[PDB]
Amino acid sequence: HHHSVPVFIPLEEIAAKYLQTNIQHFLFSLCEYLNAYSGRKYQADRLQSDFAALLTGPLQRNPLCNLLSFTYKLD
Amino acid sequence: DETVAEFIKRTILKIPMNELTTILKAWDFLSENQLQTVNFRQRKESVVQHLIHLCEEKRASISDAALLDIIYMQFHQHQKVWEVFQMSKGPGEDVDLFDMKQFKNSFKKILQRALKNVTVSFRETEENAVWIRIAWGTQYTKPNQYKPTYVVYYSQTPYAFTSSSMLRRNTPLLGQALTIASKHHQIVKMDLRSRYLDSLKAIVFKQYNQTFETHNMDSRIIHENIVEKERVQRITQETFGDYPQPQLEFAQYKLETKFKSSILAEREEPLRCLIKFSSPHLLEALKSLAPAGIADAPLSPLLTCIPNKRMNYFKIRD
Amino acid sequence: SVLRPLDKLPGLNTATILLVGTEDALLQQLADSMLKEDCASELKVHLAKSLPLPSSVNRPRIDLIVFVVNLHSKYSLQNTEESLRHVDASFFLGKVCFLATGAGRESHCSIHRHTVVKLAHTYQSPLLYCDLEVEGFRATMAQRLVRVLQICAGHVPGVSALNLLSLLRSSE
Amino acid sequence: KKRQRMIEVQDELLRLEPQLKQLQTKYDELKERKSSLRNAAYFLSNLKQLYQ
Amino acid sequence: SKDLKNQLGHLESELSFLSTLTGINIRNHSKQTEDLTSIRKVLQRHRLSGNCHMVTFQLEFQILEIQNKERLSSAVTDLNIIMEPTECSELSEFVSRAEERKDLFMFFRSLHFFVEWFEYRKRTFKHLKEKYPDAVYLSEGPSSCSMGIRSASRPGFELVIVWRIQIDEDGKVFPKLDLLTKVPQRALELDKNRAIETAPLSFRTLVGLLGIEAALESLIKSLC
């Protein structure tokens, strides 16, 4: 009917492949995907917020948080 | 030159007076120590003249005016009619690692190799949004700054919104640039146009219903037909839901059905009709039609499927 | 079912009126204006959209029927024309009234006044004019309707509905 | 006139690439499928006759 | 009080439905609250037991809810789980890993996947046992890891198939299938083609060809 899963999360594929068979496997796969995304986003946000002195410029990041790139100089 | 000054002056004249300071602070072209020297208490003309003088004393390029125009447009964003695109990908393709620099480079190179003179301005903002302003031109004319094209792209999503201003001439080129820079294969236009960008955003992303269930008086008057009233109320509540309706303002239907009513019984040709629904807040006036007594209890499915089917223009045949 | 005037016995100092129309808000406002005052009798107001009514035995006898016709919509006129075929002739002997609404704003009218004039003349019933959107006129119309209901209910010695039929008769 | 020709040739190439991609994947998976099937059949027959 | 009985029945039915849908049957739960305010900090000690369809567990943890003007930070400061002392060492290894990592959801996910693979292996071993009771010898039982294939004609030529369940450092679960050949030197001096030492690798190709149980029954039929 309706949900609150983000758009960039591949929900349609998991649904089309697991909704009609083994619904619990579909639920656990969605759980794994959401947990991984939340963990990656939390890592990125904590690195950006806490250690702002060692970073020279803002780091590059995508919505799915699957590609990071940053330059840093330590003292 | 003088064209840049005229562009900046027109853009500033478009901006109202009460919110000009916020736009100037968001632009961040002139230094902060140069803003308090100007007095925003006098007439608008003198303020605009002083701002033009300040922007002329400093080196003013064409990118700063484009950035100011992008800021003004994204601050108003209700002066144009917006349309939606949808891009498809092959089955055997993997999830890509989106990069902003490569996307910008590809989107610029496509238009630079197709046309000759074309201006592209980017603005990457949070909510995972990229605003693109395009000034079109060809090998024998200069880019026209009076008729720009605005695009709002959401990274790693198959959707992109566009302002219908002049792309009717360069629609396939813009589609090719979008489907190449974003690493897609196909692109199609959805039958959904609207002036309210937030309503289109909520409808396309189907996130307008955010309610989930979880556990964590004058007795002398006798109202007859009360059962019919409660029935029509229940039917309306079940059909239109209880969530706040998205704000639309227009709907269009084309009809090619036969007339069935002795009267035109021998006719074998359809009746061509075009109907338009217009309202300041659509989907809210219709919901109040059945309780008011102007329509039946269940409305036609053509009127109660606007947000669910993500369609605004309809064609119906026999 | 067909409504009959004298199917049930009257109550103890009780008068009942029935209002048939398509606009429910106007009927509610008219009922409120009728019941907002104090009189010697016990008044009851029933509201309906069209005839016939849902079957019931608990409903007491009806003393007066008022058909509200909105001149700004043909739907109400068609509804009244359809409802006028479910009442017996014995009810038209001074117990039926017509109330036309919307004659003030002529630019909005979709029905000619000759139509409602001929409709009222055909069934031998009075025709009243009032703009129910204004409270000042609605109060006076409600008081007049209350007086007519008290006359028709039999609470005035010497005057009946058959006499009211002759009192409100038109020359042409 | 030449601009539209350029656009349509770009469209043609963009439409034609993924078919080649999918065909290559099918080919180089079917090859190893057949090779593994043959190897498994040989080993199974050899062990069967050995135990026999 | 019929409505109350109906509500109780509906709640019990919903509880049973959720338990059989998710796969976790939860026992009683206890909570203790402590207000340690300096901006406010609360300490909540929770304790609960349960089981997953084969394995019982009892966990006790404590969270520190820091409520303030704009944020509500909740972090599991301490956790401790205890289960019955079986012979599975990797299960206790992951228990200690999740104990030192202080994570709750990954534990449940890995436990679900582990018990699913365990019941898969159990229902797979016992099926081929009664189907071919003259060609297999389950020395330890259907709830074990090893498997012994042997023919009643000669007790010398017989081999073993190994099925283990592995849990990596990330938390995911993946099995592994190997075999070990205990064949006397008479078959080696008999056959000079030397097609037995490459048996495991090729065997994996076999299970990578047409399935697991198909390869198992093919090996049973070939040894038969």
Side-chain angles (χ1 to χ4, degrees), chain A residues 1-12 14-75, chain B residues 1-215 218-259 262-267 269-317, chain C, chain D, chain E residues 1 7-34 36-48 50-86 88-153 155-224:
Chain A
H1 205 255
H2 62 294
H3 53 70
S4 54
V5 182
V7 188
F8 35 83
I9 295 297
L11 174 62
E12 302 296 330
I14 310 179
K17 70 155 313 182
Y18 274 146
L19 183 60
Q20 313 297 333
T21 50
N22 211 13
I23 175 67
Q24 54 181 4
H25 200 275
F26 157 81
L27 296 180
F28 275 105
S29 300
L30 196 60
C31 284
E32 283 188 339
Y33 270 78
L34 292 178
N35 276 306
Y37 161 71
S38 278
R40 285 191 265 100
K41 191 172 66 63
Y42 175 81
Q43 289 187 9
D45 285 333
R46 185 166 183 175
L47 179 78
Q48 164 59 221
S49 158
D50 290 3
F51 297 129
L54 299 180
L55 270 65
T56 65
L59 85 170
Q60 306 179 20
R61 188 176 56 181
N62 42 6
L64 203 56
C65 296
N66 58 334
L67 172 137
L68 273 72
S69 63
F70 55 92
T71 188
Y72 64 101
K73 323 184 194 305
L74 65 146
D75 296 328
Chain B
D1 61 69
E2 195 277 346
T3 43
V4 177
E6 172 65 28
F7 191 21
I8 295 181
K9 182 162 52 183
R10 169 162 39 90
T11 306
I12 293 178
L13 286 180
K14 289 184 178 182
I15 300 176
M17 189 57 180
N18 48 15
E19 61 176 356
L20 186 136
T21 317
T22 305
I23 305 300
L24 262 296
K25 187 63 179 61
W27 190 20
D28 215 312
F29 173 68
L30 302 178
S31 169
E32 191 269 347
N33 50 270
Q34 297 181 25
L35 292 180
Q36 75 278 3
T37 76
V38 194
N39 46 329
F40 300 95
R41 192 75 274 183
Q42 58 179 353
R43 293 280 295 272
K44 176 71 171 302
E45 191 174 13
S46 315
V47 173
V48 171
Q49 284 291 339
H50 198 195
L51 287 178
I52 286 305
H53 289 57
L54 256 56
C55 286
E56 185 69 22
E57 290 178 7
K58 197 182 300 180
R59 299 271 69 87
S61 48
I62 203 178
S63 315
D64 307 315
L67 182 62
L68 178 63
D69 204 338
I70 289 179
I71 290 177
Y72 166 84
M73 184 54 187
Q74 88 173 33
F75 251 86
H76 282 250
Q77 86 173 210
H78 275 7
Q79 309 294 139
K80 290 293 186 60
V81 182
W82 298 91
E83 314 176 357
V84 193
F85 274 105
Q86 189 175 11
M87 296 177 295
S88 315
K89 198 192 303 178
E93 204 73 19
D94 62 79
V95 46
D96 67 326
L97 294 87
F98 181 79
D99 195 6
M100 196 63 223
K101 295 182 178 301
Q102 307 292 337
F103 174 82
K104 290 182 177 179
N105 283 15
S106 315
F107 190 86
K108 185 179 303 179
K109 286 299 178 56
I110 290 300
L111 301 181
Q112 281 291 340
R113 74 159 180 80
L115 303 172
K116 189 58 178 299
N117 306 331
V118 52
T119 302
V120 279
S121 315
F122 291 90
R123 183 162 177 84
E124 171 192 6
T125 175
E126 188 54 5
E127 172 188 80
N128 316 123
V130 182
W131 281 69
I132 310 174
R133 179 186 180 273
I134 304 178
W136 301 98
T138 177
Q139 287 78 5
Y140 43 89
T141 57
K142 59 182 301 179
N144 183 22
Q145 305 293 334
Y146 294 92
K147 308 299 180 58
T149 299
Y150 299 96
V151 181
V152 182
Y153 177 65
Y154 280 80
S155 316
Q156 294 174 312
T157 63
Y159 309 106
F161 306 89
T162 173
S163 88
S164 87
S165 198
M166 199 47 237
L167 66 142
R168 291 181 55 182
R169 179 60 185 87
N170 313 92
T171 301
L173 180 52
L174 186 60
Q176 260 191 352
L178 280 177
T179 193
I180 287 297
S182 63
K183 303 180 182 301
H184 280 284
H185 299 166
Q186 306 162 352
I187 183 177
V188 80
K189 179 173 297 181
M190 304 174 61
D191 307 78
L192 190 63
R193 302 172 48 182
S194 168
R195 193 172 55 94
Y196 294 87
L197 186 58
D198 294 1
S199 291
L200 294 181
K201 201 176 314 181
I203 287 179
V204 169
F205 295 147
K206 48 199 170 184
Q207 54 186 7
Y208 51 89
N209 183 20
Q210 299 290 122
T211 49
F212 302 92
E213 280 71 22
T214 176
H215 39 265
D218 218 359
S219 45
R220 287 179 290 180
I221 303 180
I222 301 300
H223 289 83
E224 295 180 347
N225 308 123
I226 186 63
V227 286
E228 193 74 16
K229 298 181 62 179
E230 72 186 17
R231 186 194 66 87
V232 63
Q233 204 72 29
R234 174 182 57 90
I235 290 300
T236 301
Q237 192 270 346
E238 288 181 354
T239 302
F240 278 89
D242 48 356
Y243 49 85
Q245 307 291 333
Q247 186 169 0
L248 277 75
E249 79 286 347
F250 184 81
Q252 178 175 309
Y253 296 80
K254 183 178 180 180
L255 304 178
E256 294 279 342
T257 60
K258 300 173 58 60
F259 181 78
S262 45
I263 295 181
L264 292 181
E266 71 282 347
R267 183 180 182 90
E269 287 75 18
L271 219 67
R272 304 173 288 269
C273 296
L274 179 64
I275 306 182
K276 299 178 181 180
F277 290 83
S278 158
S279 158
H281 191 344
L282 206 60
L283 297 177
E284 200 75 17
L286 303 174
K287 185 184 179 181
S288 57
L289 287 186
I294 323 183
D296 295 358
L299 273 180
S300 198
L302 308 179
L303 297 176
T304 60
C305 71
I306 306 297
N308 187 85
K309 281 193 173 182
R310 308 183 304 179
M311 203 183 301
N312 207 25
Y313 289 68
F314 295 83
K315 298 180 180 180
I316 288 93
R317 289 88 58 179
Chain C
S1 198
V2 182
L3 204 62
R4 201 196 304 261
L6 294 181
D7 257 4
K8 302 178 59 61
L9 296 174
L12 265 61
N13 197 29
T14 299
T16 308
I17 194 179
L18 175 64
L19 303 177
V20 181
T22 54
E23 295 83 11
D24 188 72
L26 296 181
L27 299 182
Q28 185 73 21
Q29 292 181 281
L30 189 61
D32 294 359
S33 291
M34 287 181 62
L35 287 184
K36 80 160 301 179
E37 285 284 344
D38 313 278
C39 83
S41 316
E42 306 291 335
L43 308 181
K44 291 182 177 301
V45 182
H46 292 237
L47 303 178
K49 174 183 175 58
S50 51
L51 297 177
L53 307 180
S55 300
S56 171
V57 181
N58 192 10
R59 185 189 303 105
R61 84 171 194 179
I62 309 301
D63 300 327
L64 185 63
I65 300 181
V66 180
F67 291 99
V68 183
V69 179
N70 185 19
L71 297 180
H72 297 173
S73 87
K74 302 203 192 74
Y75 189 69
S76 51
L77 178 61
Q78 296 175 4
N79 183 85
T80 53
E81 290 280 354
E82 174 67 25
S83 306
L84 276 181
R85 302 189 299 105
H86 293 73
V87 283
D88 50 358
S90 159
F91 228 134
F92 289 97
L93 297 179
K95 291 176 175 295
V96 172
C97 280
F98 293 95
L99 177 59
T101 307
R105 294 179 294 183
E106 190 180 348
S107 45
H108 293 54
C109 295
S110 167
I111 304 176
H112 211 267
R113 291 173 53 178
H114 166 73
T115 300
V116 293
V117 162
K118 182 181 180 62
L119 178 62
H121 174 261
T122 301
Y123 285 87
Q124 306 287 148
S125 303
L127 179 63
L128 309 179
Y129 287 97
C130 178
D131 286 326
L132 300 181
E133 45 263 32
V134 188
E135 193 269 346
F137 308 145
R138 189 170 71 252
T140 307
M141 180 53 61
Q143 296 308 310
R144 294 175 60 190
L145 287 182
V146 164
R147 297 193 71 91
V148 173
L149 170 63
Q150 279 188 339
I151 288 184
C152 293
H155 294 359
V156 179
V159 181
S160 75
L162 197 57
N163 202 339
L164 187 62
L165 182 62
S166 158
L167 292 182
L168 305 181
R169 189 191 307 270
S170 297
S171 291
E172 264 71 21
Chain D
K1 184 182 60 179
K2 289 288 187 177
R3 195 177 306 172
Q4 301 181 6
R5 171 71 181 276
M6 166 183 298
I7 293 183
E8 70 185 16
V9 173
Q10 174 57 70
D11 272 83
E12 178 78 5
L13 181 62
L14 178 60
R15 184 171 53 91
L16 261 291
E17 162 67 26
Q19 187 175 0
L20 177 133
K21 182 67 174 300
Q22 188 70 20
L23 287 179
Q24 177 65 29
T25 73
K26 182 158 55 184
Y27 181 78
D28 59 2
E29 72 190 22
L30 189 54
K31 290 215 309 300
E32 58 100 350
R33 159 71 186 274
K34 180 255 299 180
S35 177
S36 45
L37 180 138
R38 175 202 61 87
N39 198 315
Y42 172 75
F43 166 78
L44 212 53
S45 87
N46 191 338
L47 173 147
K48 174 67 223 74
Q49 196 36 62
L50 198 169
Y51 190 85
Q52 183 53 15
Chain E
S1 278
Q7 263 67 258
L8 257 299
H10 291 354
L11 288 185
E12 289 288 340
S13 87
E14 180 177 344
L15 205 157
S16 159
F17 155 78
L18 189 60
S19 198
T20 179
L21 171 64
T22 298
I24 300 297
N25 225 317
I26 189 177
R27 217 46 56 94
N28 48 10
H29 167 243
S30 316
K31 179 197 302 181
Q32 305 294 336
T33 308
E34 287 82 12
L36 278 73
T37 311
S38 159
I39 306 178
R40 186 185 181 184
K41 297 184 177 182
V42 190
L43 186 127
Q44 303 176 356
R45 307 181 184 183
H46 308 258
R47 175 205 305 264
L48 70 93
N51 65 325
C52 201
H53 185 209
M54 279 154 218
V55 43
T56 73
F57 63 93
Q58 168 87 256
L59 55 100
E60 152 205 341
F61 62 99
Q62 48 179 311
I63 61 179
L64 176 61
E65 204 281 332
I66 302 180
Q67 198 278 334
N68 213 326
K69 314 154 300 302
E70 67 290 338
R71 92 269 183 168
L72 285 82
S73 282
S74 316
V76 180
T77 67
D78 190 10
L79 167 65
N80 198 333
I81 69 181
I82 44 182
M83 297 148 57
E84 66 285 305
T86 76
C88 186
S89 159
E90 192 144 59
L91 191 51
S92 75
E93 183 39 52
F94 174 81
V95 157
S96 285
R97 286 205 298 257
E99 162 80 17
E100 81 99 2
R101 287 175 178 267
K102 306 174 183 179
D103 200 1
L104 213 62
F105 306 150
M106 181 181 59
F107 163 75
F108 282 110
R109 301 198 312 270
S110 85
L111 181 64
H112 167 264
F113 283 133
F114 175 81
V115 72
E116 189 232 10
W117 269 107
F118 185 81
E119 80 174 13
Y120 267 174
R121 181 180 63 178
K122 186 175 183 179
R123 75 179 71 259
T124 299
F125 267 4
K126 67 150 54 183
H127 183 270
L128 266 43
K129 169 63 181 180
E130 71 196 0
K131 175 178 288 299
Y132 289 96
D134 63 278
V136 70
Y137 288 86
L138 204 46
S139 159
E140 202 62 31
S143 60
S144 304
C145 320
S146 87
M147 168 183 173
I149 177 157
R150 176 199 304 177
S151 45
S153 158
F157 205 112
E158 52 89 30
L159 50 152
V160 305
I161 303 176
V162 178
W163 195 341
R164 291 150 52 186
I165 304 179
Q166 203 74 43
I167 303 180
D168 65 338
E169 271 311 325
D170 192 302
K172 288 184 286 294
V173 175
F174 70 101
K176 47 168 52 58
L177 286 174
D178 316 77
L179 60 78
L180 319 170
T181 43
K182 179 194 162 189
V183 48
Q185 206 142 20
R186 193 168 187 178
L188 209 153
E189 62 89 10
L190 182 157
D191 173 72
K192 301 289 139 282
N193 204 3
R194 310 302 298 115
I196 48 102
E197 63 269 59
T198 189
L201 300 123
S202 86
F203 157 75
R204 307 212 290 188
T205 317
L206 187 65
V207 64
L209 183 56
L210 68 156
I212 307 98
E213 43 87 16
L216 295 183
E217 64 193 48
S218 84
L219 212 62
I220 295 155
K221 289 186 178 181
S222 46
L223 196 74
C224 166

